[PDB]
């Protein structure tokens, strides 16, 4: 039953951790063991005879379940070994496992697939031969075939799908068609209302802004993440959301009218009710003050001052008052003589 499988998934998970502290993980024999595990995974007579059983056997086939579980064990074991021990992370050692990875990526179970996505990101840097390089290109197509069917991006398989997609654009020279990127931002943006499960999706957004890819949907994404920076309770989301928005604002082209609105938003969020919400805002204030053009500061100088003193002057949270003074403290020396 399903309850028992989850117990086994726990017990197997403990074994893999034990292998991490086991010495044989340091040897190359472990690689062959996983390779073995991969390829182990893949009438008149009755008229006379007295029959005394009224019960019938019920049809069931767990043989598929056995293969997937063992295959799941293989991928989890393999990824642990190569990451902990760098020397094994070599094309010559891992060439044999490529024909298994293509097979697993098509598997119906997603737990096995997610592990297949985990390993492939580790090997994305690693150079490979002509036949063994196609898998990275195919997996890029396959993850789309997941975001194809999947209703909501806030799924374990979809979330990891964006993770591999991010590393795909960051590292592999090949890049996907702009239209495919345009759609994916389409699917991410609705589910972004609930950021607690979109952490990986954020990192993928970070990957695009690093490469400076131009898409219409990024501008809307920038609008949404800015709200998440100040509204969401979770610290971790507020961090990544602040970074991607901060990188977005400086790099891409924006109309001068838009620029004033973005900084206009930033200051009024300084008057956001919750202490955490405004606290993240000073983090963006601090990033503008520490790293910005003298002109941009000068255009914005007198304004940032009067907003900071307000929070310092009257605010319920003592910490925010102190920080606003600190922001003023580091902001005043950098001002021009006129400002």
């Amino acid at each position: 039953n399903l309850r028992n499988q989850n117990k086994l998934s726990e017990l197997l998970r403990r074994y893999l951790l034990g292998l991490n502290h086991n010495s044989d993980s340091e040897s190359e024999s472990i690689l062959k063991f996983c390779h073995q595990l991969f390829q182990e995974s893949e009438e008149k007579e009755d008229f006379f005879l007295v029959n005394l059983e009224s019960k019938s056997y019920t049809i069931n086939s767990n043989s598929l379940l056995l293969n997937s579980t063992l295959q799941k064990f293989a991928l989890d074991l393999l990824r642990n070994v190569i990451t902990r021990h760098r020397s094994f992370l070599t094309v010559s050692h891992l060439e044999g496992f490529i024909p298994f990875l293509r097979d697993s990526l098509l598997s119906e179970n997603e737990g096995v697939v997610i592990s297949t996505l985990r390993i492939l990101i580790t090997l994305i840097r690693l150079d490979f031969s002509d036949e063994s390089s196609e898998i990275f290109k195919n997996c890029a197509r396959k993850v789309l075939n997941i975001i194809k069917v999947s209703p909501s991006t806030s799924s374990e398989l979809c979330q990891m799908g964006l993770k591999f997609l991010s590393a795909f654009i960051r590292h592999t020279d090949s890049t996907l068609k702009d239209t495919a990127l345009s759609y994916v931002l389409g699917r991410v943006l609705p589910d972004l209302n609930e950021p607690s499960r979109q952490g990986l999706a954020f990192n993928f957004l970070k990957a695009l802004v690093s490469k400076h890819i131009m898409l219409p949907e990024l501008y809307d994404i920038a609008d949404t993440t800015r709200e998440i920076m100040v509204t969401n309770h979770s610290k971790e989301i507020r961090d990544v959301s602040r970074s991607v928005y901060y990188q977005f604002l400086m790099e891409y082209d924006q109309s001068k009218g838009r620029l004033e609105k973005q900084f206009k938003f930033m200051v009024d969020n300084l008057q956001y009710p919750t202490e955490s919400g405004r606290q993240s805002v000073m983090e963006l204030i601090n990033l503008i003050i520490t790293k910005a053009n003298p002109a941009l500061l000068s255009k914005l100088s007198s304004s940032f001052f009067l907003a900071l003193v307000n929070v310092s002057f009257n605010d319920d949270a003592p910490r925010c008052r102190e920080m606003a003074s600190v922001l003023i403290s580091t902001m005043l020396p950098k001002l021009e003589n006129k400002d």
Binding site: L144, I147, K148, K177, T179, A180, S182, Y183, V184, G186
Partner: peptide, 7 residues
């Protein structure tokens, strides 16, 4: 949108 990602 279902089609574009196919491409």
């Amino acid at each position: 949108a279902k089609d574009m990602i196919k491409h």
